[PDB]
Structures are given as C-alpha cells and as structure tokens.
Design an enzyme around this catalytic site. Structure first.
Site, short mmCIF file in Angstrom:
data_model
loop_
_atom_site.label_atom_id
_atom_site.label_comp_id
_atom_site.label_asym_id
_atom_site.label_seq_id
_atom_site.Cartn_x
_atom_site.Cartn_y
_atom_site.Cartn_z
N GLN A 74 0.66 -1.21 -0.02
CA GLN A 74 -0.13 0.12 0.09
C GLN A 74 0.93 1.12 0.06
O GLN A 74 2.10 1.06 0.32
CB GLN A 74 -0.82 0.00 1.19
CG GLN A 74 -1.86 -0.99 1.20
CD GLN A 74 -3.03 -0.89 2.39
OE1 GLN A 74 -3.91 -0.14 2.09
NE2 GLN A 74 -2.74 -1.51 3.40
N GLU A 75 0.18 2.45 -0.70
CA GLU A 75 0.72 3.78 -0.63
C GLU A 75 2.36 3.54 -1.14
O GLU A 75 3.44 3.97 -0.62
CB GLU A 75 1.03 4.56 0.75
CG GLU A 75 -0.33 4.75 1.14
CD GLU A 75 -0.81 6.02 0.55
OE1 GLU A 75 0.03 6.58 -0.38
OE2 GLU A 75 -2.08 6.38 0.89
N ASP A 76 2.37 3.28 -2.47
CA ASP A 76 3.43 3.21 -3.16
C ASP A 76 4.28 2.28 -2.77
O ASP A 76 5.43 2.06 -3.18
CB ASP A 76 4.09 4.40 -3.20
CG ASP A 76 3.43 5.57 -3.95
OD1 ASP A 76 2.74 5.21 -5.03
OD2 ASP A 76 3.54 6.85 -3.63
N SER A 77 4.01 1.34 -1.70
CA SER A 77 5.18 0.28 -1.44
C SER A 77 5.09 -0.86 -2.31
O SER A 77 4.15 -0.88 -3.26
CB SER A 77 4.69 -0.22 -0.17
OG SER A 77 5.74 -1.31 0.41
#
Ligand SMILES: [Zn+2]
Ligand SMILES: [Zn+2]
Ligand SMILES: [Zn+2]
Ligand SMILES: [Zn+2]
Ligand SMILES: [Zn+2]
Lengths: 252, 98, 49, 49, 48, 44, 48, 64, 134, 48
Positions: I7-10
C-alpha cells in the site's frame, strides 16, 4: 584525575566523548572528548616581505614545473632562514633561489645552479653565495649530487629512449666508479655519458643540444667524453643493443 | 492462486514483465540514531561523533506543534533535558551567576 | 612533469587516479623589438615562450 | 547558450590581460632601473595555469 | 540596575575560558579563540 | 611488503623509505597485493 | 538497541533490571548504563 | 555482467544456455526459435536470456 | 493488493528472486588520503601506530594495518576498524588514522599508492559493500 | 608548560584542559561554569 581509581589510564570513548575508569566502568567527565574535533574519520613588513618571497618561490618553481611538495619544503627553509636573519643583508630573491636549490637537493631531485639561475633573476654566483651561507645558517647539509640524478631529466628533455637513458646512467656511474673523470663535475660526466650513449644509438644528439639542455659547454663535454671514450666498451652495459658499435663510436 | 491457501483469487490479476530500476536510495544509507552521543564543547549541544548520531533538529514547527499539544513537560525535555541540561548557582541579591 | 622533471604524456586515467589536472602546456611566439633612438632597431624572437 | 568555449574564452581574455599587465610592471621596473629585462622571466605562468 | 556612568567602560570584563576556549589542533598547538586574540591586543595596548 | 605496478603488473617489494617508482617501468601507481588472510564468503 | 530509557530501580523491577544489566550491550534487550544514587554513570560494556 | 545462473522468477538453470543461445543465433535461428530450442517455455525464463546484456565480454578487454 | 504490504507506493518483492540475485548490487566507496610535510614542525606519515610511539591511543585495534600503515585488499572492515594508519610528529607522535563509520562495513577492494599533483605520497582505498535488496 | 596567573588563560577563569580542574571551582571541564576576568582601563572608553 580519576575520582575512583587514581593512577589509572582513563579510557577515551568516542561513543559519548567521555573517559571511563578502566577497572570500574565509572564514567569520568560528562562528554569532554569532542571526538569530532579529534578525528574527522594591515600587514607586518616582515610578513609582507615573506609573502613576496612566497610569491617569488611559487613563480620560479612553476617555470620548471617543480611539484608543490618542493615549494612547501622551500617555504619552510625560507622561513627558518628569514627568521634566523644571518642573511638579513642578502636580497630575498637570492635567498629564495638558494632555498629552492637546497629543497631540490634535500628532495633528491637536484637542479643544477644554471637551471635555478635560468628561472631566477639572480646569477649563479650570488645563488652560490647564499646557498653556502644558508647551509651554515641552518647548520645542515645536503647529500652530494650524483650523475644519476640528472640522467632522467636530461634524457627526457632530449627525448632519448628508455634504453639510451639507462645506458647513459650505467656509462656515467661506471665512469665514476672507474674514476675515468677525476674532478670533473657530475653534470659534465652525465652530459658526456649521454653524448656517448646517444652517439651509440639511432637517436644521435649533438654536443650543443646536450650542452644546452644539461647546461655544460661543448668543450667540457668534449673533454669529459675524451676521458671516458677509451673505456667505452667497458662502460656500456653487457645487455645493450648497439645501432653503432662501441668500437666505431666518434673519436675526437 | 493465493500462495498461502492455494485458492484461486476471485479477481484475475494483471501480471507481466515490466522494466524496474533500483534507485541509489538504500535504507542502510539513511538509517541513523542518536542517544547521548558526542556534543560540541563550545555549544555543549549534540554533534556527530564517529557515526550518524547527530540527532534531529527539534525546530520551531515541533515546538509549536508540542505547544498546541500542551505537552509542556515533553516540550521542556526535548528543548532542554535532551540537549544541554545545565545548572548554575545564582545570587539572590544580585541575580548574577555565582 | 614528474618530480625529477621528466615530462610525460598524461593519460586521463592517470589524471583521475593520481588527482592530476589534465592540462596542455600553452606556448606563444614573442617578438621583441627595441629602439634606442640611434636609427637602429633590434628584433629578437622568443620561440615558443 | 554559453558553452565551454564562450565561457573559457571569457576567462582566458581576463587572464591574458593580467599576464600582459604583469609583464608591463616587471619590464617597466627593469627599464626604469636602466637595464634590459629577460622576457622569459617577466611572464608569470601561474596566471593562466 | 542601570546608570549613565556605567555606560562608560572603565574596566573591561574578560569572558571565561569556556566562552572563548583554546582548542588543540594538529598536535599540541593550542589554537586560541578569536576573543583571546583580541584580548592579547587589549592587554598589549593597555600596558602600552 | 609487495606492490603491483599498475602498468606492467610486476610485483616489487618496497620499504617505507624507498620511492613508489616501479622498479622496471618507472610507473608511479602501485596496488597492494591481495591479503593472505582467509576471508570466508557464505554463498548467499 | 541503540536508544535507551532510564528505568528507576524499584523492588518490583529490581530483578527484571538485574537481568537486563547482566545481559548488557552484547545481548538485546540489555542495558547501556547504570546511574547510582550519587549521580555517577557506569557503562556496563566496560565492566559487565 | 554475466548470464544469471538461475532464472530469478522460477529458478530454472539458464547459466548454461547462454553460449548455446548465441550459437543458435549465429545459426540464424530467431530469438523465439532459439529460446524454444533451449526449452525455455516460460516467459520468465525467456526474459532472462532475451534481455541479458553480456558486459563481461566487454570487461575482459582491459588488461588485468 | 496482496496482503496490504504494498500500500501507498510500497512494493512487495519475491524473496526467492532476491536470493537468486535479482537487483543485487555492489556499492564501492573510495577513501583517499595523503601524507604532507607542509610545515617543518609537522610530518605526517603512513605507519601502524604503536603503543610506545603514541602518547595516547584508542582501544580500537590497528591489527588490520600492514607494516606500511595501509590495510590490505580482501580484508573485512567495519566502523570499528582503521583503514589508514597515519601519524604526525609532535613538536611522542600523534595518531591521525582514518576510521570508517559504524555503518560502513565491507571488504577492501583495491588500495593504490601514488604521488598526487602535489608530489606527496597519496593513496586511495576502495571498499566494496554488497547491497542486497531489503 | 603551565598556565600563568593574571594571563589571558588564568586558571581562575576556568578549566584549562579536559584533564584538569580550575583552582577556583575545583570542578571539571563541564562542571566549571567559567569565571570572568577584568582589565582595568588606564583611560575610560566609550561603550560602542
Ligand atoms: Zn574507580
Ligand atoms: Zn550576588
Ligand atoms: Zn612498471
Ligand atoms: Zn523462469
Ligand atoms: Zn571554575
């Protein structure tokens, strides 16, 4: 001054910059080491005259492309001499030129007096006088020059091949060992050894060319050559290739 | 298929070869910590020693934030106890450090 | 120019390795003329100064 | 766009003016003293280098 | 707490050593602080 | 104390006193010889 | 392991803290220092 | 630098298929035919050889 | 959206691919040091400092250094190690060795010694550290 | 080899070296807060 264990070598610690009792662990001093400072891991006439001397040294040194380590060494020699003042009566240009000669000698890359004279307005004569005075003023001495110290510069300036430079080096050293050139100046012997080696090779150079680069009169080269010429086959290395055989080298 | 239970995933997943690049920003080059490390002797404040233990600047924004939080005890610790705890003896009559 | 004063062509790798400055010696021909109000002029040329 | 040429030409023009300025000063001192000057000594190679 | 005559410097205060310390650098050389440098001139001119 | 000439790869022994110059090629770049100490790499 | 918190020794944690002291820095969790009643600091890595 | 020993995605040995692959390309096989001939069925294994850049051949041009 | 760790650009990576060399890389750090005699009172020189030679020495071991004061290639180094042993003469002699940071851990890849532009003894130590995706 | 009294580095002004204590405070480099010296001016000076 350990509070706990007197006469103890407190251990300096970088973790916090403090000293610890080496046999208790008690921390002495809060954070007194300042480890980062330890390991990284309008002008006086005397200073103005020294500054002008430094500008003169860097200028003379640059003309002959002398490395900066020699300049720093020269500046340190100049400071001691200038502070010692036994040459206070001598001109700073003479002291600087004489200091530059001494620094090159101390570094083992001697420059003949004619070479230092060629870059400085001071004549060889006055450079020679200040040179001897400085050695006394500094109470020091420089190693005696040898024929091998000039071979690298002269042969390179003459664009001579590596083997010719090596042959000239052997010829000059062997001529000195055989004492074929008593009292001659090493420059004269070096120039003569270079002339002999050059004439034996395809890269032939005249006495004037060698004389101009080495700073020796052709007469002095001719005389020095005439003394070593009879032993030429003994002077050349055993593992040398002759373009012109040693027995046929120019006789004069 | 789900790797843990093997059940097929209800939605079909878009998958294929895509060119990826590794950037020079490795975490080992950015991780740093500071706990009672070396301090500047003149300023008596944190500085890097032989590591990246230089500490974090508790700037105006953190002070203002902690002020809004009303954490006056923590605000005092961060701006004093944790950086340059010092104490002096002062004269009550002349107010000068004695 | 080595410590001994022997000039050598500098390869760029040596310049990067030995922290040298990759520089080319610049020379200029200079002609010096002097006049001593004696209806004579002396012209001398300093080649590749 | 001032590339390596126009940029270095601007410096060399300034550094050459200083070189000529320095040669005048040195040569003038010797001429005033009434003696000839060695052109090879007047030039301060440090200016351009 | 404030007097006009106190605006004239009749005696000069010298800061503590910790305010202008002399650090040891490149060996035993005691690198004096900027204030110590001026304090040297102050006392020299004062004695003169 | 062996150094390898960077040009002619010729090993030469140099003391603290003698210059860096290569014994035969004169080149002034010398690389220390690989340590004899045993370094173990887990093949991971 | 690098950062620390000063736990006050109480008869309720004396034993737990005694464990962390013997573990020191070599084993995590452990302890970096001990502060005595005198205010003196002892680094456990020097004399564990 | 050099061909990976195992295909990153699935582990198939591909480190022994590089000179075979280059031999096939010299024999005028297309890249698709060469990979098929080598038995690289999965696109993950095919991506290994098809996209490899053999810089070690370029590093060996510098004397030791 | 496999288990939310991306999540969130991970990004989630295949551990077995990383174990097979996927995106594995090598980081080379080159450390340069020179010995300069600027100022006749000070003379810095490469040599392994010894207890009787230095009036004060830290407990960090210099055993990695060779007799010439330089670490040899193939030697493992960490922030506790000294890569260059340099000492300057006092007007006993001070030790001004070059340490690595606590984060710096690798193997000495190459050590070259030369004379720099200034003619001073100079050396560069290249330390090799392998960066595995994590 | 030692600091001189009445000099810029007078030991009463503070601790001279981290491995020492000033005689006035008897405290270490960090314990000593430092103390002020003074220069009596031979002539009054205007405070800038
Ligand atoms: Zn004790
Ligand atoms: Zn009071
Ligand atoms: Zn060589
Ligand atoms: Zn595959
Ligand atoms: Zn005090």
């Amino acid at each position: 001054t350990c509070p706990n264990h007197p006469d103890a070598i407190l251990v300096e610690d970088y973790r916090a910059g403090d000293m610890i009792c080496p046999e208790c662990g008690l921390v002495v001093g809060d954070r007194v080491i300042d480890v980062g400072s330890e390991w990284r891991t309008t002008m006086s006439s005397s200073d103005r005259a020294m500054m002008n001397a430094f500008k003169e040294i860097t200028t003379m040194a640059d003309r002959i492309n002398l490395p900066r380590n020699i300049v720093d060494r020269t500046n340190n020699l100049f400071k001691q001499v200038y502070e010692q003042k036994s040459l206070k009566g001598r001109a700073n240009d003479a002291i600087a030129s004489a200091c530059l000669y001494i620094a090159c000698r101390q570094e083992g890359v001697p420059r003949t007096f004619k070479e230092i004279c060629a870059v400085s307005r001071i004549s060889k004569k006055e450079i020679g006088r200040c040179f001897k005075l400085i050695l006394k003023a500094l109470e020091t001495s420089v190693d005696l020059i040898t024929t091998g110290d000039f071979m690298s510069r002269f042969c390179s300036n003459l664009c001579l091949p590596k083997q010719v430079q090596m042959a000239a080096t052997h010829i000059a050293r062997k001529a000195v060992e055989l004492d074929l050139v008593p009292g001659r100046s090493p420059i004269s012997v070096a120039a003569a050894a270079i002339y002999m080696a050059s004439q034996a090779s395809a890269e032939k150079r005249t006495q004037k060319e060698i004389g101009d680069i080495a700073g020796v009169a052709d007469v002095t080269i001719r005389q020095s050559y005439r003394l070593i010429y009879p032993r030429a086959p003994d002077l050349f290395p055993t593992d040398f290739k002759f373009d012109t055989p040693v027995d046929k080298l120019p006789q004069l | 298929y789900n790797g843990f239970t093997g059940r097929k995933i209800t939605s079909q997943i878009f998958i294929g070869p895509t060119y990826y690049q590794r950037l020079k920003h490795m975490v080992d080059d950015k991780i740093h910590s500071r706990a009672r490390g070396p301090i500047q002797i003149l300023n008596r404040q944190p500085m890097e020693g032989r590591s990246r233990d230089g500490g974090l600047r508790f700037g105006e924004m953190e002070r203002d934030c902690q002020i809004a939080h009303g954490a006056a005890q923590f605000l005092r610790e961060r701006l004093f106890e944790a950086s340059d705890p010092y104490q002096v003896h002062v004269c009550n009559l002349c107010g000068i450090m004695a | 120019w080595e410590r001994d004063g022997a000039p050598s062509p500098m390869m760029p790798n040596e310049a990067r390795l030995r922290n040298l400055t990759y520089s080319a010696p610049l020379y200029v021909d200079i002609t010096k003329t002097v006049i001593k109000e004696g209806e004579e002029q002396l012209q001398t040329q300093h080649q590749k100064t | 766009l001032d590339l390596a040429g126009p940029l270095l030409a601007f410096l060399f023009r300034g550094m050459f003016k200083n070189l000529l300025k320095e040669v005048r000063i040195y040569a003038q001192k010797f001429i005033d003293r009434g003696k000839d000057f060695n052109l090879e000594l007047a030039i301060k190679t440090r200016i351009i280098s | 707490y404030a007097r006009p005559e106190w605006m004239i410097v009749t005696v000069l205060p010298v800061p503590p050593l910790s305010v202008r310390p002399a650090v040891v650098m490149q060996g035993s050389a005691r690198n004096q602080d900027d204030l110590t440098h001026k304090l040297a001139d102050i006392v020299k001119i004062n004695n003169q | 104390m062996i150094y390898i000439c960077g040009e002619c790869h010729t090993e030469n022994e140099i003391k603290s006193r003698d210059p860096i110059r290569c014994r035969e090629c004169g080149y002034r770049i010398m690389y220390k010889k690989r340590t004899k100490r045993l370094v173990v790499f887990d093949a991971r | 392991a690098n950062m620390t918190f000063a736990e006050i020794v109480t008869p309720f944690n004396i034993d737990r803290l005694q464990e962390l002291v013997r573990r020191g820095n070599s084993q995590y969790p452990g302890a970096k220092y001990i502060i005595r009643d005198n205010g003196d600091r002892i680094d456990l890595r020097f004399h564990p | 630098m050099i061909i990976p020993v195992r295909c990153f995605t699935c582990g198939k040995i591909v480190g022994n298929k590089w000179e075979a692959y280059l031999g096939l390309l010299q024999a005028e096989y297309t890249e698709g035919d060469a990979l098929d001939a080598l038995g690289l069925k999965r696109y993950c294994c095919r991506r290994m050889l098809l996209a490899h850049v053999d810089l070690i051949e370029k590093l060996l041009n510098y004397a030791p | 959206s496999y288990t939310g760790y991306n999540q969130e650009d991970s990004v989630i990576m295949n551990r077995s691919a990383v174990d097979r060399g996927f995106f594995r890389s090598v980081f080379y750090r080159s450390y340069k040091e020179q010995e300069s005699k600027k100022g006749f009172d000070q003379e810095e020189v490469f040599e392994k400092p010894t207890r009787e030679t230095c009036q004060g020495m830290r407990h960090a071991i210099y055993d990695k250094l060779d007799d010439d004061g330089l670490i040899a290639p193939g030697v493992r180094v960490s922030g506790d190690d000294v890569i260059i042993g340099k000492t300057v003469t006092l007007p006993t002699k001070r030790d001004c060795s070059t340490f690595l940071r606590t984060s710096e851990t690798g193997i000495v890849d190459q050590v070259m010694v030369t004379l720099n532009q200034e003619g001073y003894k100079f050396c560069k130590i290249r330390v090799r550290s392998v960066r595995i995706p994590q | 080899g030692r600091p001189k009294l009445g000099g810029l580095m007078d030991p009463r002004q503070g601790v001279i070296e981290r491995t020492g204590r000033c005689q006035t405070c008897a405290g270490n480099m960090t314990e000593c807060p430092g103390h002020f010296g003074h220069i009596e001016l031979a002539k009054p000076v205007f405070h800038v």
